[PDB]
Structures are given as structure tokens and as C-alpha cells.
From Swiss-Prot, chain A:
Disulfide bonds join C23-C97. Glycans are attached at N18. This is Programmed cell death 1 ligand 1. It is linked to Truncation of the 3'-untranslated (3'-UTR) region of CD274 transcripts leads to elevated expression of CD274 in multiple cancers including T-cell leukemia, diffuse large B-cell lymphoma and stomach adenocarcinoma. Disruption of 3'-UTR region is caused by structural variants that stabilize CD274 transcripts, leading to overexpression. Increased expression in tumors promotes immune evasion and tumor cell growth by allowing malignant cells to escape destruction by the immune system. It comes from Homo sapiens. Residues 2-110 form the Ig-like V-type domain. Induction: Up-regulated on T- and B-cells, dendritic cells, keratinocytes and monocytes after LPS and IFNG activation. Up-regulated in B-cells activated by surface Ig cross-linking. Interacts with PDCD1. Interacts (via transmembrane domain) with CMTM4 and CMTM6. Interacts with (phosphorylated) STAT3; promoting nuclear translocation. Interacts with CD80. The chain holds residues 18 to 134 of 290 of the full protein. It is found in: Cell membrane; Early endosome membrane; Recycling endosome membrane; Nucleus. Highly expressed in the heart, skeletal muscle, placenta and lung. Weakly expressed in the thymus, spleen, kidney and liver. Expressed on activated T- and B-cells, dendritic cells, keratinocytes and monocytes. Plays a critical role in induction and maintenance of immune tolerance to self. As a ligand for the inhibitory receptor PDCD1/PD-1, modulates the activation threshold of T-cells and limits T-cell effector response. Through a yet unknown activating receptor, may costimulate T-cell subsets that predominantly produce interleukin-10 (IL10). Can also act as a transcription coactivator: in response to hypoxia, translocates into the nucleus via its interaction with phosphorylated STAT3 and promotes transcription of GSDMC, leading to pyroptosis. Belongs to the immunoglobulin superfamily. BTN/MOG family. Ubiquitinated; STUB1 likely mediates polyubiquitination of PD-L1/CD274 triggering its degradation. Ubiquitinated by MARCHF8; leading to degradation. Deubiquitinated by USP22; leading to stabilization.
Length: 124, 126
């Protein structure tokens, strides 16, 4: 039974830091990239994807442009980690790691962002 | 490119009625049942999980037990139709239809429930 697992379902990160949220899927024999789909979203915003071939930036939500990447060569180890650079207050929320590979599953991850007064005030 | 489509992304239904909400996906003449996964959820509650040509409980959420079914006769037309019988106020919200069939895609559908005072009052107090 194909299952996606997340080692942590809660991250608490500092405004302005970099964040890597881990997401794991089973890979027994050699990874068959042509059969794999990885999709990340947060509250219906397309963050990143890898669809058999590769990544399609055309559908990426503007709030994640040039800040989000998938570590591509960790996919052969069953690792679908999302890296977000320069965390913003709008990055707080519930993320979903959706994977298709000889089955389909997803997991949720909650992200909390701590931020100083100056940053919070501008977002106010 | 594999695409799921919703003819309607908004349903307005009466409390106590039956509702069928639909996602369409492309089927080229013949459905390969072994390849298809259909998953319906509302607010992280599992409603339907169709895998290997059969519906799969007991991952189904208790709120939807015996009230939710996938109309399997529609699948060969590429229609993933969720029927919910005896609609309740707690059925209002955002539904998602997640489909793997070669490719994978998902769509959202918003459901609003109208209800008379007596039904809302019970929902209000519990
Ligand atoms: C729904 C799903 C995805 C969705 O992947 C994507 C979702 C997107 F919106 C997009 C972006 N829009 C699609 C696109 O670029 C062109 C187009 O319009 O077709 C890309 C995805 F890969 C990727 C991987 C697995 C599953 C999935 C499918 C069925 C499931 C399930 C997960 O888990 C629970 C069981 O059922």
C-alpha cells in the first residue's frame, strides 16, 4: 500500500530563515522518474511540481516565485523535500505534499512563522 | 496534459436533500480500472477512496458513513460523481476531487447548505 510519510508534521520557523519541509515516499528498485509526480501546495497555491519530465513554473503561484525548489537528486532516495528560502509571514499555514508513484497519497504539514514587531507591523 | 474539470464549482443545496457533485477526467474510449484512483475529501475528512476498482473503507470519515457513494456507473464516461444523501449543515464547505489516472490533478467545489430555523438551531447548539 503506497504511503507518503512526513517525519515532522509541524515546523516552527523564524521570519527570514530558510525552511526545508521533508516528505518521504517508498522507492524500492531504481527510481522510475517517468512514473513519478510530486506536487506541493499551500492553501490552494501551487508551490512547485515535478511531473514525470520536470518542473512547470508556468503554474507556480507568484508568492513562491524564485523562493521554492525541489531537491531533485534526493528523489531517488524517496525524498520529496521542499526548500523555501527567505521565509515570509504569508508562508505560515498548512502545506500538502502530494505524490503519485505506483499509487497516490498525500500528507499535511503545518508551518508556524515567528516574526519581530517590525515585520508583523508592515503586515498590518 | 492530464486535467480534472468541474462543470460546476458551486452547489447550493437544501438541507435534507440529496446532492451529486461531479469531477470529470479524460477517458480515451476504454477505462483502465487498474490505473484509476479517485479520492474525495472535504476539509481533510476522507469521503471516498476508490482504488483497484473498489471503494475502500474504513478510512472513510464517520460523518459520511452510509451517506456518501461514488456513482461507479459514471466512471467509464470519465465522471467521478460523489453522491451524498440526506444533506446536513456540516456538509457545507470546500470539497476536493483528487484523481490519478496516468497523470494526476485535483479540483475544488464549494457547497452551500440552506436550512430552516429548526435545523440551524440544533446545529447552533451542538
Ligand atoms: C492530485 C494529486 C496530484 C496533483 O498534482 C498536481 C496538481 C496540480 F494542480 C498541478 C498544477 N496544475 C496542473 C498543470 O500543471 C496543468 C493542468 O492544468 O493540468 C500539477 C500537479 F502535478 C499529484 C500527486 C498525487 C495526487 C493524488 C491523486 C489521488 C489521490 C491522492 C493524491 O492522495 C490521496 C488518494 O488519492
Amino acid at each position: 500500500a503506497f504511503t507518503v510519510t512526513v517525519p515532522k508534521d509541524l515546523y516552527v520557523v523564524e521570519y527570514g530563515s530558510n525552511m526545508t519541509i521533508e516528505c518521504k515516499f517508498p522507492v524500492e528498485k531504481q527510481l522510475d522518474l517517468a512514473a513519478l509526480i510530486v506536487y506541493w501546495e499551500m492553501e490552494d497555491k501551487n508551490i512547485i511540481q515535478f511531473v514525470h519530465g520536470e518542473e512547470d513554473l508556468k503554474v507556480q503561484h507568484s508568492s513562491y516565485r524564485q523562493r521554492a525548489r525541489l531537491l531533485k537528486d534526493q528523489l531517488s532516495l524517496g525524498n520529496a523535500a521542499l526548500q523555501i528560502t527567505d521565509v515570509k509571514l504569508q508562508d505560515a499555514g498548512v502545506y500538502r505534499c502530494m505524490i503519485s508513484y505506483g499509487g497516490a497519497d498525500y500528507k499535511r504539514i503545518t508551518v508556524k512563522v515567528n516574526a519581530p514587531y517590525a515585520a508583523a507591523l508592515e503586515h498590518h
